[PDB]
Amino acid sequence: PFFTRNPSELKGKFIHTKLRKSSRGFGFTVVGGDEPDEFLQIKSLVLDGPAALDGKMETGDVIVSVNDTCVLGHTHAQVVKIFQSIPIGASVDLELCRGYPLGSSAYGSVKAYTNFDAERDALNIETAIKTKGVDEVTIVNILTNRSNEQRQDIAFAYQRRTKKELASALKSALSGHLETVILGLLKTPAQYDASELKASMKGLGTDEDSLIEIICSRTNQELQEINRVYKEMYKTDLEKDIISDTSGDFRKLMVALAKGRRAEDGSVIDYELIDQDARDLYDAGVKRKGTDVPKWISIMTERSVPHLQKVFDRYKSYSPYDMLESIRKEVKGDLENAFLNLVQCIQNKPLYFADRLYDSMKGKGTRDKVLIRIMVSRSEVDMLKIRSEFKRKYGKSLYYYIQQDTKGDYQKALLYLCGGDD
């Protein structure tokens, strides 16, 4: 939460831009400036409007000065009154500072580069691509220290300087697992999830594990973008593809989870409902011979995750087995695997990914597809929590295991995504 009210103590890039207030304002949304030491950054822009048409303003930029007046550390309502008082047709001068991300998970490992230069990085990447023997170290040292958004702009700058999409270029220069890591980093969170989903459903046999990991661990917000982008790329609804390659009660569970319509975190704790769901889960499984499966699917998919965390504790007051052990006894197959993965993500999702990373490396060889997908998909989310749970359980760091199990530039590429030892 870094904040300052002196411009000389900012360390981003400074942009000066002049805007003329249209009939629909300057056409941008501002956020921040609410809790004492808080910045004001650009939430969104209006494509039709003046702020975007000028092009100089980017989202996540901090408003330094508004027409000669420094607004660093001014309240949200103070600087809003400045812009609103500008008459239609009048012009405003904005000094903007970029390098301070608007939104960023506090527990990710890879952080946005402060001195970001999309054009320079695309030029340094093409330098490493064209090098005799290929300079894999440079491509790794660059793309693993940039956020996914910054990688979406480098892929723009690379096409604008080569007329060749950076994906195809790096595909031809890289090989082995290092190629798989880099190609996944160059996809948006929705793109990479949507690609690894379809890839799990190539051929009659399906990679049920990869399917279970992605669907069980993603949030409603993440699943909405996945369902959108999946039809965008593969010309078909993700639900539709799921009905095809899945079947049975396991199909119901995947379709319900993939809909991304879980109830948001309730404002008030439903203690009365926590007891009811806990008893219903008991009535529908271990209390009787047999299993009322749709009751499990309904409760475990429609309740908020904080709620379900508390029913799994309260469920121990009705059942001599916990929710995990009860799943192994009442059900089997891919339905069993799905339920076990699901409640792990509900109880402790970072621990869920820490356990998965340990399984991919504990035996002979590496399950590289699982290791790479987790390091890519959780690098900007909860990688620090994953590393935290990992060392507590297994005694040594996640860094130490990637070091033993992988080698080469591929090893260094994953160690950057890890983000240091523990």
Binding site: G25, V30, V31, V80
Partner: peptide, 7 residues
């Protein structure tokens, strides 16, 4: 979920 204002 923070407060936004359109300018």
């Amino acid at each position: 979920t923070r407060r936004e204002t359109q300018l």
